[PDB]
Amino acid sequence: AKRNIKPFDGEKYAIWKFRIRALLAEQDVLKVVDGLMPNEVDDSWKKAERCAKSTIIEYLSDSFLNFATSDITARQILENLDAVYERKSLASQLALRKRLLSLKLSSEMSLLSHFHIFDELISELLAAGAKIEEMDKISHLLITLPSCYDGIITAIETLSEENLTLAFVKNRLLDQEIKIKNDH
Amino acid sequence: AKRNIKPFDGEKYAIWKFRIRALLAEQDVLKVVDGLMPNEVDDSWKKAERCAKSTIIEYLSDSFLNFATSDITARQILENLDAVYERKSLASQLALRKRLLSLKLSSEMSLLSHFHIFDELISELLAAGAKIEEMDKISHLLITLPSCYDGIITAIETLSEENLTLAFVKNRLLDQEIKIKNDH
Amino acid sequence: AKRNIKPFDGEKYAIWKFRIRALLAEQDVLKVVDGLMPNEVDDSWKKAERCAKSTIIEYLSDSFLNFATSDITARQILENLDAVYERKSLASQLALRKRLLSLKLSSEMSLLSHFHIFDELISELLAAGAKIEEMDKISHLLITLPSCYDGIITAIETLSEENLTLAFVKNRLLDQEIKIKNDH
Amino acid sequence: AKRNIKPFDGEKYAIWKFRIRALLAEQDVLKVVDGLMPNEVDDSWKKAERCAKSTIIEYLSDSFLNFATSDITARQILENLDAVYERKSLASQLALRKRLLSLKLSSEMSLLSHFHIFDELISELLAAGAKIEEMDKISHLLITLPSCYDGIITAIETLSEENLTLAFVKNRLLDQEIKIKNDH
Amino acid sequence: AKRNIKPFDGEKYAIWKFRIRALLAEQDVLKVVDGLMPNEVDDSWKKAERCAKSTIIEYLSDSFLNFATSDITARQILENLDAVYERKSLASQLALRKRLLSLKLSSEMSLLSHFHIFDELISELLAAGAKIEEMDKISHLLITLPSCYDGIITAIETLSEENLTLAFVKNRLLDQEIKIKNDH
Amino acid sequence: AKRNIKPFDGEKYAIWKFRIRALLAEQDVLKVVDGLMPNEVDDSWKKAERCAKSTIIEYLSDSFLNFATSDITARQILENLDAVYERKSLASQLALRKRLLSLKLSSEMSLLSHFHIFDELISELLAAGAKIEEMDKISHLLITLPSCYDGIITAIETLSEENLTLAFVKNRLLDQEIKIKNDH
Amino acid sequence: AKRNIKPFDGEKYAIWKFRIRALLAEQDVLKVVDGLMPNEVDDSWKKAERCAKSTIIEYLSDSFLNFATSDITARQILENLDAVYERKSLASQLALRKRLLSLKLSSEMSLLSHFHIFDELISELLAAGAKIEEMDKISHLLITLPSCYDGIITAIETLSEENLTLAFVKNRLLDQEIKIKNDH
Amino acid sequence: AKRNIKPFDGEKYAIWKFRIRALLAEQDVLKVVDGLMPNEVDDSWKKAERCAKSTIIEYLSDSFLNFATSDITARQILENLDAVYERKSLASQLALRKRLLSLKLSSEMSLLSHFHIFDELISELLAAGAKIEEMDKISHLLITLPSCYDGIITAIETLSEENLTLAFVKNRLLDQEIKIKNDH
Amino acid sequence: AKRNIKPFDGEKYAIWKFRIRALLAEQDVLKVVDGLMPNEVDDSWKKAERCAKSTIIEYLSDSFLNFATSDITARQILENLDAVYERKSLASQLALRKRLLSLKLSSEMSLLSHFHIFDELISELLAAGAKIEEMDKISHLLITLPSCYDGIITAIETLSEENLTLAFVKNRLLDQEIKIKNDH
């Protein structure tokens, strides 16, 4: 169907799963993976069962084709992929925290790009089962900033006391950014 | 309409066969390849045979169309392809096992390529008629790894208690590989 | 009576408040601070209030006597001190999260002192109302460990995340510490 | 009873007087100094008077008992001590203003001890009779700080007036100087 | 009551716990920690619990007050301190035994300091969960002394054993040190 | 009871006597020293006698115990100490006057210590039996000041001698002094 | 209550025992040590036993706290300390005698301190079960004197041995002392 | 009660005995030491004896406990101490008189210290079996002065020898000292 | 019949008298010397008088035979011998003990001679009336030994705690000094 779905090669599994779910819902097939099992099978509940399986097999890389083996239903294929990939794994959380602590701003990349990278990494870490509160997100973001971003954040903690949100600090940081570039 | 199935060109026959089988099952046609030959043949079987033959011919390379030039049903076409490119040879099995047990991971060559090599070898073993169980596959993969991974090998073989699978072990080895690369 | 209570010089307000409350409860005087103000006052209540206020003034450093110059009962003194200090500003919480995420094991310091520091860090972060799951504590404790702990970390990561408690992790880490000191 | 009150040595009269008053209130003796003279004096009143006199003499330095040599009540001793160390002398107020404005922080100096110096200057200046409010106090404290604090001082002076208290700004300066010594 | 108990700050937990238990026994409060939780909403029981908690907090250093910040029973605090400072780990016992077997003695350091070192090692080995009797204690001690003490170690070991105490051996060795001091 | 009273070592008898008298008054014992001996003695009077004698002996230096070795009451002990150390002597007070007329303020030493020296000198001169009026004290204070005070010394004498008290002139001298250091 | 008692650390057990006994008798507690065990125990006897045990534990050093680990009363602890430290043994008294023979008088130290030291030595020797006749004390005194006392020792040895008490020889030696110090 | 008494270390026994005697007099206990033994002894006598023994023991240094270890009343303890430390021997008196006859005034040392010196000299002479009245003390003082006092010594000798007192002659000598200091 | 009694020669008279009295009692004749003179003399009495006179004559030396030449009864002879030697001290025990304590082993002089000398010295000490116990004799013999015997000394005091006599310790010392003379 839609060719925008990159074949699943074991990376960014949540993105591939969301794309597959959206495409299945597009053809009125998503009900198979998350629905109610009828006590007896019907013709309507006979096509979507295998249509979803064929769709999943279509958008899978060659190595991962073993997840079906022509005997596992489409729901259970995704269930197995979930049990192997979207698992709350402590190793993934440690790796994500280690890489998060390594984020440093460089003059050769834009501030918005760094915001996007931070947001995606935070979302991935949240997917790893760990719980992060908004203030913890902000603190993780701030330690990445360089020394030039000193006065702005100090004013942030001193003045703001209740509007302390990731969106607000992002807005303040980006608004401050132009004053550095023209200053060099 | 599933264009992700690369037409067969004499290489990687198992994946092509699996994709073909999935597509055939999608269109309510695989029943004529797996099952029996009912004495009362009617339109339900004739149309299925015609659709299967058309799909096989379309998804085969022009040079490989010789396998279905004559009036041969899809079942015998698949039988011939199995007999020609999935030949059961015990000597081939022994040679494959000798080469697999001698496989080792080189420093300059990444874990993904080693995994692909192991996957193609195990696919050849299964094609050669050798019956290999998944824990045997896990053992074969772990014995061809350097000493730097010894710790995770011991941890997986002893501390892990759930039902081991190839993908899970591959994920853990990938995590160890990236951790080592950060270390080195 | 109890002479171990350091007079409040403006730091560790919770500790000083807890010690003062314990001392007042020892002489059965904490009832005035905590219990409701009786509609009719008697000699016992007046004596208890006088003794409580006297103890508060006695164990307060000279720079903070201003909190007691106003003719107010010990209840108002403690309430004012709570309003001034029993609150976590944005700066305090961000510094807490920074020092947690920037925590590292020094060479000379053993696991006992490091674990004590980590525990008090969590407690004072918990004192700010920041809910933290045991997984987050385990991850924070693992990231601050040096590179010589890699094997035990990898072993721990393979456990099921149903019995993973902080205490078991600390025990295994101390066991690894014994061997590391042996291997030096 | 309490031995925490250092004997009055001509310096920091306000703290000594406040602690003596608190101690007298502890033993229910402060009524002699503050309460009106009863028309009829009983055993209880004379006992309280002699106890107060003994307590004040005990916590007074030897050279300062010339005030008490005349057989007069402790109330008059406190009154005369107030008259001779708490006087409305304008020249003193001007000189202390001049020294307070010239209170630039030194590098080899701790902000807690700087706060103590400022607090003692303010207390003795109020003893000199010049009334200073909390706004004037915070302005005086902020003008003493070096230029490295300019960001937080600007931020806090942009804050609303109602929540501006000396303790609050002291906490903010402590929090920011934590970063200052961190950032070196 | 008893002042001799040094507040606990993470060193020699056994002595502190023993003295704390003795102090609780003085006030007849050991029933709270040692009883089979005879909870019968008794006011005497509540008073004993409060007194035990107050005494435990009293002789705890400010760093470790987090162990009793929560509203947990005195037995709860004691068992927490036990679990964190007396860990039944076999590797620690083995390392301690290896150190003991290679203790020996210095060339200038006097018998009292060696006795303190041996006592500390034995105490922490008992805290480690190793069952050791006084005969084993003496045997371990006697095998660390130089050749100048052979005459006394042989003499004491040929003794009829039965009722002999470690302190008696210490007294004999102190007398032997006094005697040998006059010559060397 | 009160341990602030320096043991009497033959120097500065008056303040030591005052402290002893105050301590006796606190325990309701001074009635022995000053109150008339009752015609009939009772247990309470004897207890007060013994307590006074013991207190006086306690707060005396060892060299001076001879004054109480004789079986005499506390009143007799104090009378003997008075007759020996506060005796009214002519040559003594002439020497005291000569020293006062030779008293000059040193540059390093501030008016507070100068005022204390003058006060104690005048007090012991009065004890010597030389009647001195307030204006005489004022003249002595004015004539013992350096040349930098000339403006204030000439100014103060112009005032009418009807309300010129020592406190007023001392306060004015301090107010002038704070200007004097300012011009240095 | 009395904090002058040095905690017992293995030196001079007799003073520690005497001080502990005196303190126990002071609080009306020594009856549990010397008085017979009552057939029935009341709350008073239990409280006295606990107080005695706690007091003994308080004045015991950390190294010797092992003497009271077991559930034993004050009597058992005291008798164990006696059996280990005041046992009447040959080695105990032999060292005492050897030091006594080495108690030579020093030039700077007068015979009062010498006699006191010798008296303490004899007392502790008697505590060691070495019954010493008064003449033996006298002889041990004389052998410790320098050549300047030859005349007096020759005089004393000629004296008849029926009423020769140590006090008489002490007085004669003191007279000889004063005569010698005259002749210098 | 009285805690200024330095524990007896073997020196200045007169002061220690006097202070102990005064303290016993405070508690109505001195009647045991000085009063005769009643034919029948009641509970009050037993309490007084016990308190006297306890007070004497507790103000004794550790080295001197042997003087009270035996079952001897406080009277026996004091008698033994007096015998061992104040012996009524003629040779002591003769040596003391020679020194006392040669006690001149050093120029650098004032009359107060010399009077003190003569005081303990005459006190120790009185301790021994010497009978000296006030007149011999006066004569000894007058022969122990330098040539500058010749006028006052001649004048004081001319006065009638019935109203002369030590205080009077000391006062005149002090006045003469005051006069002489002005002349040198 | 008892020829074990040394004839009296003017020394050790008390021993001779005691042995004579014991012998006379053994012969049922002591009633003559001790019992009262009967009013009428019987053949038994005169026979006893003759026997006692002859016995005493037998155990007198020739030089002292003059005491029995006169026609006097045995009672008169014994009374005269008492009047001449009943109370006289045998020798100066003081110098004897001083010699004993000053005894020291010399290298050339063999251990047998030292044992002999110590033996007779203890012999006069006992004979002159001084009471010495076995332990005291052992201590005296040990303290006069060099440092080369220390090992056997420790062995004796440790092992032989209940089996100690002069004979056994002397035997062990001889056994040890054999080897010691071998090791020189």
Residue numbers in the entry:
A (entry chain H), B (entry chain I), C (entry chain F), D (entry chain C), E (entry chain A), F (entry chain D), ...: 3 to 186
The paper states:
Here, we show that the Ty1 retrotransposon Copia forms virus-like capsids in vivo and transfers between cells. Copia is enriched at the Drosophila neuromuscular junction (NMJ) and transported across synapses, and disrupting its expression promotes both synapse development and structural synaptic plasticity. Because Copia behaves in a viral-like manner, we used cryogenic-electron microscopy (cryo-EM) to determine the high-resolution structure of the Copia capsid and found that it is distinct from the related dArc1 capsid, with a larger internal capacity and the presence of pores similar to those used by retroviruses to carry out their reverse transcriptase activity. The capsid layer is composed of the Copiagag protein’s CA region, which contains 2 alpha-helical domains.
Our purification protocol enriched capsids of sufficient homogeneity such that we could determine their structure using single-particle cryo-EM methods. Our reconstruction of the Copiagag capsid when enforcing T = 9 icosahedral symmetry reached ~4.2-Å overall resolution. There is a layer of featureless density lining the inner surface of the Copia capsid that likely represents the RNA that comigrates with the Copia-gag protein. Because the RNA does not adopt T = 9 symmetry, its density is amorphous in our reconstruction. The NC region is not clearly visualized in the map but is located in the interior of the capsid and is associated with the density attributed to RNA. The Copia capsid is much larger than that of the T = 4 dArc1 capsid (inner radii of ~220 Å and ~170 Å, respectively), resulting in ~2.2× increased internal capacity. We hypothesize that the Copia capsid is larger than dArc1 because it packages larger cargo, such as the longer Copia mRNA (5 kbp versus 2 kbp) as well as the Copia-encoded enzymes reverse transcriptase and/or integrase. Moreover, the Copia capsid also lacks the spike structures that protrude from the outer surface of the dArc1 capsid. In place of the spikes, the Copia capsid contains positively charged pores at the center of each hexameric or pentameric sub-assembly, similar to HIV. We found that Copia capsid formation requires the presence of RNA, as removing bound RNA using anion-exchange chromatography inhibited capsid assembly.
